Amino acid sequence: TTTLAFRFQGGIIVAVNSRATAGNWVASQTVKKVIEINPFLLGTMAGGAADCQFWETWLGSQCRLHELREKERISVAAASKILSNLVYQYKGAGLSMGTMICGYTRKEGPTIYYVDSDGTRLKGDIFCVGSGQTFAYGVLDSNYKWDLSVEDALYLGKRSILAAAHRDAYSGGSVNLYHVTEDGWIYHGNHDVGELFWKVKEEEGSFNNVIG
Amino acid sequence: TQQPIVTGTSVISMKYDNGVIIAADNLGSYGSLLRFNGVERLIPVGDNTVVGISGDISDMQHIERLLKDLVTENAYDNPLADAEEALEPSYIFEYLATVMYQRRSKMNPLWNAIIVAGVQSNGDQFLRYVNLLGVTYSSPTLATGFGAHMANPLLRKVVDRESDIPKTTVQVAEEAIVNAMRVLYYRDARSSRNFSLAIIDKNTGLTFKKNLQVENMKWDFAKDIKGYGTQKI
Amino acid sequence: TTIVGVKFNNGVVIAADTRSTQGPIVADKNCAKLHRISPKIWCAGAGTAADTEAVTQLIGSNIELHSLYTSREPRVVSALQMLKQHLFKYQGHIGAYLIVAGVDPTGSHLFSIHAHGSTDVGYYLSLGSGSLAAMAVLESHWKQDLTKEEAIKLASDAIQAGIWNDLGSGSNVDVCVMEIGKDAEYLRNYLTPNVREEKQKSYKFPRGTTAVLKESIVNICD
Amino acid sequence: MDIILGIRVQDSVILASSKAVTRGISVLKDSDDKTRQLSPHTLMSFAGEAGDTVQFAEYIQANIQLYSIREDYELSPQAVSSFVRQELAKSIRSRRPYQVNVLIGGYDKKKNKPELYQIDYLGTKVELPYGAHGYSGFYTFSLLDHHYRPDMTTEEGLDLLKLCVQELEKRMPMDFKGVIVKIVDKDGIRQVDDF
Amino acid sequence: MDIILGIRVQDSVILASSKAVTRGISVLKDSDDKTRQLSPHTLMSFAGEAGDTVQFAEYIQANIQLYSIREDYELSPQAVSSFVRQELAKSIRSRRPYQVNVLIGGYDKKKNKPELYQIDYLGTKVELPYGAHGYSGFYTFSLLDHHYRPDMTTEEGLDLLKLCVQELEKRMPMDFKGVIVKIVDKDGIRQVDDF
Amino acid sequence: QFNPYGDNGGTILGIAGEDFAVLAGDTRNITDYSINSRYEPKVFDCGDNIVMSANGFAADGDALVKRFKNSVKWYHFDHNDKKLSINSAARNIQHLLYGKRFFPYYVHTIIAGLDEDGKGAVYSFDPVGSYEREQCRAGGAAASLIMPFLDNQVNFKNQYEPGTNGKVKKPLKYLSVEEVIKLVRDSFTSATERHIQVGDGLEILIVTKDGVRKEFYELKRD
Amino acid sequence: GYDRALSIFSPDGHIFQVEYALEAVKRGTCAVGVKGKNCVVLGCERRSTLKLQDTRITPSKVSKIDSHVVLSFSGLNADSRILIEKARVEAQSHRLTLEDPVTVEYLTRYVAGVQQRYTQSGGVR
Amino acid sequence: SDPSSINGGIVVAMTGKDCVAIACDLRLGSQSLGVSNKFEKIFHYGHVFLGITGLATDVTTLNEMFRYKTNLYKLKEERAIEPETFTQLVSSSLYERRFGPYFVGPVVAGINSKSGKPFIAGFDLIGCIDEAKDFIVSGTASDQLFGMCESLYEPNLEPEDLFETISQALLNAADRDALSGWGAVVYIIKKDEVVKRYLKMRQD
Amino acid sequence: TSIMAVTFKDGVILGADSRTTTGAYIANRVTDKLTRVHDKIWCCRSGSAADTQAIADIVQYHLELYTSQYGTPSTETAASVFKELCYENKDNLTAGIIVAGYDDKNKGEVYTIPLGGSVHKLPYAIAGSGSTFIYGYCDKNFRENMSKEETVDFIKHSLSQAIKWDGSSGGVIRMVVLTAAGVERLIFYPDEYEQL
Numbered sequence A: 001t002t003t004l005a006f007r008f009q010g011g012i013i014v015a016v017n018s019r020a021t022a023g024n025w026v027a028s029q030t031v032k033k034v035i036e037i038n039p040f041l042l043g044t045m046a047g048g049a050a051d052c053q054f055w056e057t058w059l060g061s062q063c064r065l066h067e068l069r070e071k072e073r074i075s076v077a078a079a080s081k082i083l084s085n086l087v088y089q090y091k092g093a094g095l096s097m098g099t100m101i102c103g104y105t106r107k108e109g110p111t112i113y114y115v116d117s118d119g120t121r122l123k124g125d126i127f128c129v130g131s132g133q134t135f136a137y138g139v140l141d142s143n144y145k146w147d148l149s150v151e152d153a154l155y156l157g158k159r160s161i162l163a164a165a166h167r168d169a170y171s172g173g174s175v176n177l178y179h180v181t182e183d184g185w186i187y188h189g190n191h192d193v194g195e196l197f198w199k200v201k202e203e204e205g206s207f208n209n210v211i212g
Numbered sequence B: 001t002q003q004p005i006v007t008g009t010s011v012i013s014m015k016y017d018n019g020v021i022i023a024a025d026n027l028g029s030y031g032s033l034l035r036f037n038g039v040e041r042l043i044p045v046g047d048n049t050v051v052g053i054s055g056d057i058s059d060m061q062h063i064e065r066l067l068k069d070l071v072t073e074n075a076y077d078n079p080l081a082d083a084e085e086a087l088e089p090s091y092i093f094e095y096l097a098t099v100m101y102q103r104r105s106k107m108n109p110l111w112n113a114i115i116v117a118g119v120q121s122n123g124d125q126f127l128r129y130v131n132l133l134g135v136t137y138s139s140p141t142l143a144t145g146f147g148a149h150m151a152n153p154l155l156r157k158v159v160d161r162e163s164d165i166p167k168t169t170v171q172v173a174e175e176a177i178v179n180a181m182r183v184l185y186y187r188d189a190r191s192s193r194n195f196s197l198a199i200i201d202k203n204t205g206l207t208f209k210k211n212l213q214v215e216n217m218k219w220d221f222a223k224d225i226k227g228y229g230t231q232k233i
Numbered sequence C: 001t002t003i004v005g006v007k008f009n010n011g012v013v014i015a016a017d018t019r020s021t022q023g024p025i026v027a028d029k030n031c032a033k034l035h036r037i038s039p040k041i042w043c044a045g046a047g048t049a050a051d052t053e054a055v056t057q058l059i060g061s062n063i064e065l066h067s068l069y070t071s072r073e074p075r076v077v078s079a080l081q082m083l084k085q086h087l088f089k090y091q092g093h094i095g096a097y098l099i100v101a102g103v104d105p106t107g108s109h110l111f112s113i114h115a116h117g118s119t120d121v122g123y124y125l126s127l128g129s130g131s132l133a134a135m136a137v138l139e140s141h142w143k144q145d146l147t148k149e150e151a152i153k154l155a156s157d158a159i160q161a162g163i164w165n166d167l168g169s170g171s172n173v174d175v176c177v178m179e180i181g182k183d184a185e186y187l188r189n190y191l192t193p194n195v196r197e198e199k200q201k202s203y204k205f206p207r208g209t210t211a212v213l214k215e216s217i218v219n220i221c222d
Numbered sequence D, E: 001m002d003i004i005l006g007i008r009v010q011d012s013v014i015l016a017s018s019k020a021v022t023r024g025i026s027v028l029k030d031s032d033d034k035t036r037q038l039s040p041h042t043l044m045s046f047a048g049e050a051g052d053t054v055q056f057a058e059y060i061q062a063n064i065q066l067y068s069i070r071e072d073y074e075l076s077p078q079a080v081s082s083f084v085r086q087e088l089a090k091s092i093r094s095r096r097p098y099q100v101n102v103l104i105g106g107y108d109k110k111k112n113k114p115e116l117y118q119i120d121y122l123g124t125k126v127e128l129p130y131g132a133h134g135y136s137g138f139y140t141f142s143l144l145d146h147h148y149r150p151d152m153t154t155e156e157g158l159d160l161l162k163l164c165v166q167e168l169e170k171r172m173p174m175d176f177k178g179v180i181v182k183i184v185d186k187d188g189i190r191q192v193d194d195f
Numbered sequence F: 001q002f003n004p005y006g007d008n009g010g011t012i013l014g015i016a017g018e019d020f021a022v023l024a025g026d027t028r029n030i031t032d033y034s035i036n037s038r039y040e041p042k043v044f045d046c047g048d049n050i051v052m053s054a055n056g057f058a059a060d061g062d063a064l065v066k067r068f069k070n071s072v073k074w075y076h077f078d079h080n081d082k083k084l085s086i087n088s089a090a091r092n093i094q095h096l097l098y099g100k101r102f103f104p105y106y107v108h109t110i111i112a113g114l115d116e117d118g119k120g121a122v123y124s125f126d127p128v129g130s131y132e133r134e135q136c137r138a139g140g141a142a143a144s145l146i147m148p149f150l151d152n153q154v155n156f157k158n159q160y161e162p163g164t165n166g167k168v169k170k171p172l173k174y175l176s177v178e179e180v181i182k183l184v185r186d187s188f189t190s191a192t193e194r195h196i197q198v199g200d201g202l203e204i205l206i207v208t209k210d211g212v213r214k215e216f217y218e219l220k221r222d
Numbered sequence G: 001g002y003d004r005a006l007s008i009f010s011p012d013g014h015i016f017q018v019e020y021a022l023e024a025v026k027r028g029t030c031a032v033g034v035k036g037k038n039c040v041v042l043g044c045e046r047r048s049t050l051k052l053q054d055t056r057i058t059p060s061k062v063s064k065i066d067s068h069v070v071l072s073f074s075g076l077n078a079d080s081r082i083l084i085e086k087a088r089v090e091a092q093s094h095r096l097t098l099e100d101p102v103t104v105e106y107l108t109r110y111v112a113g114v115q116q117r118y119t120q121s122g123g124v125r
Numbered sequence H: 001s002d003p004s005s006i007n008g009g010i011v012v013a014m015t016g017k018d019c020v021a022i023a024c025d026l027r028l029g030s031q032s033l034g035v036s037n038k039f040e041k042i043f044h045y046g047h048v049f050l051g052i053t054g055l056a057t058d059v060t061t062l063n064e065m066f067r068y069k070t071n072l073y074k075l076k077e078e079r080a081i082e083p084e085t086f087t088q089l090v091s092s093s094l095y096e097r098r099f100g101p102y103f104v105g106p107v108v109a110g111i112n113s114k115s116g117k118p119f120i121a122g123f124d125l126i127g128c129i130d131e132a133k134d135f136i137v138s139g140t141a142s143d144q145l146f147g148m149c150e151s152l153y154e155p156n157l158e159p160e161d162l163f164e165t166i167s168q169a170l171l172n173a174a175d176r177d178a179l180s181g182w183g184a185v186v187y188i189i190k191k192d193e194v195v196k197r198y199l200k201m202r203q204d
Numbered sequence I: 001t002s003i004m005a006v007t008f009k010d011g012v013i014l015g016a017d018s019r020t021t022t023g024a025y026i027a028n029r030v031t032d033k034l035t036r037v038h039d040k041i042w043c044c045r046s047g048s049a050a051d052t053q054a055i056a057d058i059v060q061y062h063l064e065l066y067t068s069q070y071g072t073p074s075t076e077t078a079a080s081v082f083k084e085l086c087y088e089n090k091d092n093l094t095a096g097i098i099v100a101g102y103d104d105k106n107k108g109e110v111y112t113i114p115l116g117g118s119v120h121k122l123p124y125a126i127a128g129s130g131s132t133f134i135y136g137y138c139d140k141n142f143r144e145n146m147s148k149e150e151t152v153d154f155i156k157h158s159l160s161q162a163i164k165w166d167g168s169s170g171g172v173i174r175m176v177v178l179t180a181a182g183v184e185r186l187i188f189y190p191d192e193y194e195q196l
């Protein structure tokens, strides 16, 4: 995997790849690594597929039960902590999860929480998680500014996944984009790396290492 | 977690036109020591089923008791215990298969390979395998241990697929089984000459044969074999 | 592999399947496991494929030089002795399991050699992963005083048992007959009972389907 | 989690804690606060195994806050440290122990004295003029042995602390991204924003 | 030994190599030059196992210098790289292999072209526009994929290199104490003193 | 030490059409180099127009199918004979699989059927419950052989329109039940040739709105 | 364990144990709550048959549950301590998991839920 | 630490009507990290072509070794080495290192200049010859290639049709393998002309 | 293996089963474990088939070369050559050999050579996995200066029991008689010896 999400002037960008591997065997190129918890909450998935898929859909049920009981949408902090407290109970049992809980609420504003299977829970503006996280960091950090436009921010998130998809062997398939605003999350399409790489190479003039 | 101590070797079996045949030798090995020679490894359940068991003998004797108790339990409050509501081979197998898998799932297996041979109430032949892992499979011919490697090839020359079953008589089928037992005696180091054989026929019923021996063996050619290469004397 | 050897009236016959595996994958569907050591001494090989080929060629080479040196036709026992001493020296690390057979001025012979360097004598032998399936057939149908045609039938039937019942063996049956006073006849693909059925569809692509970035003429000449 | 320091001076306790959070070959964050306020005049810094550290710190925090509400009274630093030690002493013989080392800096309002306690994951408690956990001690202790005086002011303590951080930044292999410094005194807890 | 980078631009090859030498929990030195001049227009940087690195680099240096005296002629970067690869290819099947990874930056005077070769300890040679060894690659490669152009000047290459060092300084766990940068071109080898 | 797992070999394949879906699987059951059965079905009609197969360790596979079949039965009892939709079945299977997260079912599970719009659906699971809907999936021993062929022939991957300079891709379209069965049969005959654990027989289960039909084909027995 | 169903229905549809618990509240000292525009005030009666009291140490009638919520009561004094303790624990538990202090409605709902549980649990009044 | 799957890569060879084709990917990596997309795995000595997968240092070493040996062969024999002869030379050289082998999967391809017969062959790391009428496969995606070739291949394909079949076999196999891809090269070899084509494939 | 050698009035008799195993599989059911190193010096082989054959081949070579120079070697000399190989290569060998020979001066002699490479001259010797089950029987039934027929019955009954209890032993019972008269081979099949 490679997944990222960063905070900026116009809210939150979230971008992920879509490859699933079993060792060197490429098992799938079309995996949904973003979970839609509710109109205002997203969750990214990296590590063990089943662990992530199972426990983040479970997280969504717990968030639904909160708003039924409390007549109010759950905070990003509370949502992330339900997951972090859950995986902490299983600490040492062998769960493998590197997740990011992204969303907007009135009291918090745009918020991103990194949560992993060894119990770490961190609030932050920028996170990259997965086997190709370093490749995504390289491009993202060197081009990141708070004052990015919604158009430029969407592209940087897409371009960062593409960079990792290219270099990391266990990353690729296609890029899934999301933009989170005060009004909720907005899906910005599935982008196949097969066509996206050459389109980016030609238009941007980058990837000169590759035989054109 | 177990290790098998006193063990029984191959159990072999096959289908024929009117029923099923099953066989197993009467040996209870203790490693390389051929300890016990009077061990019966074919156990009849009613007049329509025979369970052949290989592997650990202590666990075999446990299974004997379970089957014995199953017959008793089935008879309770059952006026048709010797008729419509009698124990079928498929019932007996599924029960054992459930136990075998439950025991492997508790990391404490019955260290056995089992073949349930019988004839159903509607006349259909029943022959199915189950082992310590809970793995089950059925085939025209089934065999355990060395039987799987040496008997099956011979028995499959007679019944290679489903359509060969009606064409195979009880005489031909038994001849192949008895031949297979001889081959196992030649080549399996933990086998014995003495064995038991059971036939379950839809017409003539259950025929249980004890104290059979491997015979018509070829050993004469041994006298001509001298040395291991060059040696002439 | 499945390999066998069967003695008969006036000589000896050996046979083999033609499957070569790489884990669970079939690498070669029609490889030749019967090897010529000398004109009338042939060898069936099981185990590590490179080792069986390498050891049989080396001893075959040295047998040729020995035959020229002594002005005599080579003997099976010489090949047997040279193979076993080589294999023993390497303590089983050369994974060659061989059935050696042939005719020479002494008569007809049939031996087996194992990787650690032990040899056995017999009228019928079988080596390889399908040796148990083959030996079951040999134990059931072998008898003393076999004819040429009976021995070929018995040998090929033993290989077939391996082909069908052993996953390690498959495809075709090779045979080599070595009769006294005659030339040895190598019967490549003596049986071919595993022919691939016609495919349901042709997968010939329309020309231009593959996207190309560059073309160039390669210079092979000087 | 790596570097946590503590210096008790005349009228205050100063805690310095590294900002870096590293996982693998990536520094995930460079602004992490490795401390929790247990009470208005008691502060606990922490370091150790991932997940365990925060889970333990917050569990202690909740317990002390529960006590404060129940009795309408603030526990002394000595009392809080003894409570924390016992929890770690229970933990070490559990099925899965907390692998967390802590420093507890507090100002005792009854005695009018600052107090610094060092407690490791085994439940080994010591009161000290200056303390550290992990590899930090192997540099700072000898440095403080030399430069530390018991009658120092808070400002002198901060300069003494700057000397430690500089030494660590020079000789430590890992980049710990500087430190968050907090002071505990008679007026409570406050953070130094420019360090 | 940790970070070594290399960038081939239009008219030169630029090598950047970390200055830190760490043993245990101590940075023993922060001004180490992890490179040797093999010939007037060929420079080799290196990284790997302690002792092996310098012993290997100097052994190669001596051999190339011996060749230069014998033939009164400078070997091409391609020739030197092939020689180095063969030595590592021999080494990997020795009783104790050299655990050294190298970058060879050179300017071919006959072709009037800069050339950068990356060779790992197994003897795996590749010519590249930009190269790195160790964990450095996991950040820099993706960064250079984006920002690198083949027709860049030496000054543009240095700015591109500054971008890599900044990223490493931000996300790398260990403190590598900056880099020594050297340029190889038609006029030979020179060092950038202010980086 | 007792090892609770085993490998029973075999391979399975699921393809989804416009108004149908197929789930195929070979009938061979093996352990090590021995054949246990030449006809042991592992593709099952579970009711509500859902077909299922759990390939790998047969004991775990049979247990899982048995439990899902039972889950369908109780779904009818508890919810007024409501039809279990394929998407609901998939989620239910995830919970069955993940329920044993710390002592897994060693199986690759595939189910097939029709979604609530009447369109063909195939879902595939890993051993611990991660699942995904797809047009195409091969599972088991020969999955690595079959899957790339499916990418090329079902989803038209790497195929461009002739003469368009590799710019226009070959357009996606649904395949007919006739064309799909051709691909299934060719996939299994190819897998049989190159994988030792695959052969004997091929059983295909086809699912339309009318019901569940079966088709059987012979495969090479070596 | 003691299992007896003490709170049960009567023919007329009343749970007398719950209604007799209200009589204990009616016996207790008066407590009043008045909320203004920007504040709430909790008044409490203290009976004057008790002189020679030590008002420093005597349990106060109004109790802090958290720094922002208070609880007063009428009825059995010993019973009130058990509710206050449970409420204080739940207040800290909420801050721990939700990272936010309780609302007054939530805290009330919790306390009320505890009181209800004791009206249909065996062995308790 | 499995030498054969550190760098990654694949080679495939096919026969056609009076022609042969050999193809390979261009990736060289270090486990997950992709390092080079220009690393060609097919070499040639006269009219004999050799493709080599496996540990990259041995790929390079063996190329240099067989160039060495074929150059001396040509000087002494006064003619170019033939595919059948070269195949025996490869096998000899690999088995010489029986107990310390090169971690490679070589593939010979070419047309015999005397008889005009198309010839391909494959080897394991210790030199066992695998001759074939149809196709030879090698590398980290050998399972994928075996599946593609076994289904797509048919005998007596014309050079232009053979190009499409071998290319589609390589591309789709490489897309199901993490350590293979990053470009591809295909050699079409006729009796006295050889065409080399670079393929467009997904770069992930 | 079950092997034994027994001295008697006229000379010595060697005895052995015919089973060779790979685990529980019988690789050869008609093996000849009695092997000639010289005209009237033979040996029984137990342990590794490869090792014992390699050793026996070397010994046969040594005794052939001994005969060319110094005439017929003694049975003791043969046992010494066996010992030398077994002792000096004890770390790489698994061979339990019984050496038996007939001189005219010394008559029948039996030397046993276990795993370590030690030499032991005895009236009779037993060895191999199946020998464990007949120590009791052989000790109770052996007598010195038996006749040929008595010694044949002693070996036959002994190996019959060894074969019966040991899974690693079976097949035919081969025997080799060494006397002044010459060398005689004997064979006994299951149908005879099993029902003893």
Ligand SMILES: *[C@@](C)(CO)[C@](*)(O)[C@H](CC(C)C)NC(=O)[C@H](Cc1ccccc1)NC(=O)[C@H](CC(C)C)NC(=O)[C@H](CCc1ccccc1)NC(=O)CN1CCOCC1
Pocket (backbone or CB within 6 Å): A001, A002, A018, A019, A020, A021, A022, A023, A025, A027, A028, A031, A033, A045, A046, A047, A048, A049, A050, A052, A096, A130, A131, A170, A171, F101, F104, F125, F126, F127, F128, F130
């Ligand atoms: C990038 C894409 C890769 O590292 C990401 O990190 C992704 C995250 C996405 C998928 C949410 N991670 C994976 O792709 C992940 C890597 C992995 C593998 C194994 C364990 C942990 C992580 N892949 C998976 O989880 C796959 C999903 C496949 C494609 C269906 N599943 C497996 O590897 C399964 C189950 C793993 C497992 C975990 C715990 C206990 C038991 C099993 N394993 C198998 O399928 C086993 N094997 C595969 C080949 O067939 C024979 C048996």
Ligand SMILES: *[C@@](C)(CO)[C@](*)(O)[C@H](CC(C)C)NC(=O)[C@H](Cc1ccccc1)NC(=O)[C@H](CC(C)C)NC(=O)[C@H](CCc1ccccc1)NC(=O)CN1CCOCC1
Pocket (backbone or CB within 6 Å): C001, C002, C019, C020, C021, C022, C023, C027, C028, C031, C033, C045, C046, C047, C048, C049, C050, C052, C095, C128, C129, C168, C169, H004, H054, H103, H104, H105, H123, H124, H125, H126, H128, H129, H130
């Ligand atoms: C039956 C089929 C099984 O016993 C026969 O006995 C045949 C014998 C015939 C072919 C002579 N046996 C084999 O075919 C044999 C089985 C085998 C497998 C593995 C080890 C030993 C025996 N198959 C092989 O030897 C194949 C031959 C290939 C297909 C040409 N070789 C391999 O599988 C090699 C193993 C080489 C080896 C080295 C050291 C000890 C033992 C074997 N495997 C690889 O090359 C795999 N891979 C290649 C690239 O580098 C990474 C590893």
Ligand SMILES: *[C@@](C)(CO)[C@](*)(O)[C@H](CC(C)C)NC(=O)[C@H](Cc1ccccc1)NC(=O)[C@H](CC(C)C)NC(=O)[C@H](CCc1ccccc1)NC(=O)CN1CCOCC1
Pocket (backbone or CB within 6 Å): C114, C116, C118, I001, I002, I019, I020, I021, I022, I023, I027, I031, I033, I045, I046, I047, I048, I049, I050, I052, I094, I128, I129, I130, I168, I169
């Ligand atoms: C009785 C059986 C025991 O005392 C006799 O002593 C006979 C002696 C006769 C033959 C002279 N002994 C054996 O038959 C002997 C038993 C044995 C096995 C291993 C070590 C020592 C003794 N059998 C063999 O030597 C067989 C002969 C082959 C089948 C022709 N060989 C093996 O078992 C080989 C040899 C490996 C070996 C191990 C230790 C020292 C030397 C050699 N073993 C295998 O091939 C193992 N094989 C691996 C695959 O799975 C099945 C077992």
Ligand SMILES: [Cl-]
Pocket (backbone or CB within 6 Å): B228, C119, I020, I031, I032, I033, I049, I053
């Ligand atoms: Cl022997």
Ligand SMILES: [Mg+2]
Pocket (backbone or CB within 6 Å): A164, A165, A166, A167, A168, A169, A170, A171, A172, H203, H204
């Ligand atoms: Mg990639």
Ligand SMILES: [Mg+2]
Pocket (backbone or CB within 6 Å): F191, F192, F193, F194, F195, F196, F197, F198, F199, F220, F222
């Ligand atoms: Mg097959």
Ligand SMILES: [Mg+2]
Pocket (backbone or CB within 6 Å): H174, H175, H176, H177, H178, H179, H180, H181, H182, H204
């Ligand atoms: Mg790929």
Ligand SMILES: [Mg+2]
Pocket (backbone or CB within 6 Å): I163, I164, I165, I166, I167, I168, I169, I170
């Ligand atoms: Mg016996």
